[PDB]
Design a protein around this ligand. Structure first.
Ligand code: NAI
Ligand code: ZN
Ligand code: ZN
Ligand code: ZN
Lengths: 438, 428
């Protein structure tokens, strides 16, 4: 039996609820994951290294007695570099070059500016002492995620960049370790899930407490990241793995099927949805999916995710396509249409957007990591708090001259007195100067 | 009778334990506040306006028949601008011009760049629909906080900026309301605490759900902000009112005492600490504190703050002074020394820094506005939403797909590889 992708129609009256169920249902159960994540964090906070080794054994299926078996030295990273092919080393280095060159152009440092009255203003910019990189490794390996977060941290000057990556059944991915070596990662712990997030956020006897945790992850990593919010810095919690492809029917249906396959091969909980007003095109995408799926090397993962969350949605016209897209509110939108800048005005709820027939998630995954912008010299001219800025701390500076204090204190005194904050007022008035006073 | 500020010495072998306790000591356990904040949030989502009114009555001591009695029309803001003094209005208007001028120059919109191979990259920038601004009630409320938060949101194009400010026992701060008029606040609700944050984060019948919540508040506001993170954008959790003054001993001791008093007078949980290598200077500040405290209108709040969290700390030298400062990680640091740029490199864990003998933390609370120079991402930027755009040409996808395909195949992510490979062109 040829796999039959789930078909939906915005004309059918049950579309509203049928769509709401596809986006909402959860097999892992909510509050269930939340409770287990809360329990894991409390354990690592109390029992420390012992808890992480036990959780690593239970959840990752590992056979390690001490924390030391879960710590990879820098030499193990350099050795991984030698165990990968030449094509894979250069591909890692080519990606590293573009990432590193971009972040070097965006790095901003400390500055001072002297006003007319002598007052000095500015910012002190210092790198965070410690940054923690979560690299997902549960159901696949993601080396580009290492480069995307470790390189801007090193460019910022973060002295210690620590990486956690789960090694299921003790299997070690040399391409991911080789990326860590090229990216300048200092230490690699072979742990994952909520226990690894806990170990970096609070610290164990063997895992250092970091200033910021970054990286994508599954429901446990995402849930653990929102809990440690406040205790430790975090980038952005990433929602469930999804792609929404919106096509006008003029893209090769195999490309669209493979684009949906690419998100689907991530994990069995992945959500791949296609929306199009072209009915005959949607039939071809179904024919493309059935033909192409069996040969796929991860056809079991793809079939599972498509069954659970995949959908081919028919809409009446471009306007309905955009309405369905705004309901779905995708973090990643593939605008596979001829006039994609003409569809964007009516698409208000979407994070990263791939536009046209030649761009898909695979390019975003491997070549566009920071804020989902592609690192080039031209894109560098446009500043971002993401990337190098996020691995830096900025302290504002004010150094008043005697005169500058005098003019500022007059204004401060008026407002502070009006608010009965007399200590504010008097500390400012102490510095007001009148040359006629002897 | 005379107040005696707590004294610690880094020459004492046990100093670290006392400093750890000074920085960790809390009056109301964070778990006690946590449960209260979580239950309030749950109650606001469940019962909407009804919960907001009940909590306003309990915590603000304000009889209110309906949610309608807690909504302040924008015309009341225009009235407030009428009731303040000439000097206060010009101080607010002059600061507002500098804040507004600054953010107008810093604003960035949507952009596109076309690479040499035809690939287009860029960002589609859209103003947030609604922003919520928290402003503490009563007199201990900086109007500069209203100007600094509502003005960049308006410059960004946020259509509805909503202020929440509790009116304890029905008391209004006309300077604060006037600053909201100048700043372009569209609507005001006289509510506060965790229930105000919860109402903005999720929406009630009368309180609109906003996209981002900003502004300073005590532990209940900050804890509510931590818990609503995810449902709504937030600025920073914001720490407790705190000042660390580091002095070489050559600043007027009355000035240092007043600088400590100014932070301590915000609320009873404020923390004011002085560190110096000059033991006689610390005795002079200690005497200044005792003499000056009874002259202060908010002496009762200051005393409670200094007793709970205040300290004067002696150290050996600049190096130890800087070491202690780095451990305290002060949200506000006053480097009251001769060469402040020489101390700062050793104090990297501090927040905003006030340098020299002529710069008090009170100047930060009453910012008279930036200038033409502070330009060259925390103002207009944080009231915009950004969408990254990658529009590869055929050739651009070919260059990028070559690198992506190798790594994806290396990790056996074959759908990724084939998806990229469909767009790779054969070379000449
Ligand atoms: N560009 C991007 O944003 C990318 C996003 N992703 C997405 O992040 C996710 C990665 O997930 P995985 O492959 O599984 O690796 P992962 O590292 O995110 O999760 C594996 C960890 O989950 C924990 N875990 C597994 N079962 C558990 C259970 N019953 N109870 C408690 N903990 C458990 C384990 O500690 C395990 O180490 C995927 O959904 C992927 O689509 C992947 C890489 C990059
Ligand atoms: Zn992917
Ligand atoms: Zn993403
Ligand atoms: Zn501050």
């Amino acid at each position: 039996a040829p796999f039959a992708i789930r078909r939906l129609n915005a004309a059918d009256p049950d579309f509203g609820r049928h769509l709401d169920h596809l986006l909402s249902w959860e097999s892992v159960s909510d509050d269930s994951v939340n409770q287990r994540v809360l329990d894991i964090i409390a354990a690592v906070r109390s029992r420390g290294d012992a808890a992480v080794v036990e959780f690593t054994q239970r959840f990752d299926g590992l056979q390690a007695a001490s924390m030391a078996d879960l710590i990879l030295p820098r030499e193990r990273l350099e050795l991984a570099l030698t165990r990968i092919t030449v094509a894979q080393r250069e591909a890692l280095e080519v990606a590293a070059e573009r990432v590193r060159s971009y972040h070097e152009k965006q790095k901003q440092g400390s500055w001072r500016y002297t006003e007319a009255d002598g007052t000095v203003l500015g910012q002190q910019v210092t790198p965070l002492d410690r940054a923690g990189l979560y690299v997902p490794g549960g159901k696949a390996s993601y080396p580009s995620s290492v480069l995307m977060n470790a390189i801007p941290a090193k460019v910022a000057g973060v002295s210690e960049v620590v990486m956690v990556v789960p090694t299921p059944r003790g299997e070690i991915n040399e391409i991911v370790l080789a990326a860590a070596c090229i990216a300048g990662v200092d230490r690699v712990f072979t742990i994952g899930g909520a226990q690894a997030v806990a170990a970096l956020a609070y610290g164990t006897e063997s895992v250092p407490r970091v200033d910021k945790i970054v990286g994508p992850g599954n429901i446990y990593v995402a849930t653990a990241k929102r809990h440690v919010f406040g205790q430790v810095g975090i980038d952005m919690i990433a929602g469930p793995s999804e792609i929404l492809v919106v096509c006008d029917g003029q893209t090769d249906p195999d490309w669209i099927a493979m684009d949906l396959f690419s998100q689907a091969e991530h994990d069995e909980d992945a959500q791949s949805i296609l929306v199009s007003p072209d009915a005959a095109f949607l039939d071809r995408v179904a024919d493309s999916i059935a033909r192409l799926l069996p040969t796929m090397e991860r056809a079991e993962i793809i079939r599972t995710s498509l069954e659970g969350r995949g959908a081919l949605i028919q809409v009446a016209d471009q306007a309905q396509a955009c309405a369905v897209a705004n309901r779905i509110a995708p973090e990643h939108l593939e605008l596979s249409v001829a006039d994609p800048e003409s569809w964007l005005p009516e698409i208000r709820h979407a994070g990263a957007i791939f536009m046209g027939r030649y761009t898909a998630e695979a390019l975003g995954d491997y070549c566009a990591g920071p804020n989902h912008v592609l690192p080039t010299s031209g894109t560098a001219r446009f500043s971002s708090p993401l990337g190098v800025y996020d691995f830096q701390k900025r302290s504002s500076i004010i150094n008043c001259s005697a005169e500058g204090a005098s003019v500022l204190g007059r204004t401060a005194s008026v407002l502070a007195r009006g608010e009965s904050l007399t200590a504010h007022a008097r500390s400012a008035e102490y510095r007001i100067l009148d040359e006629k006073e002897a």
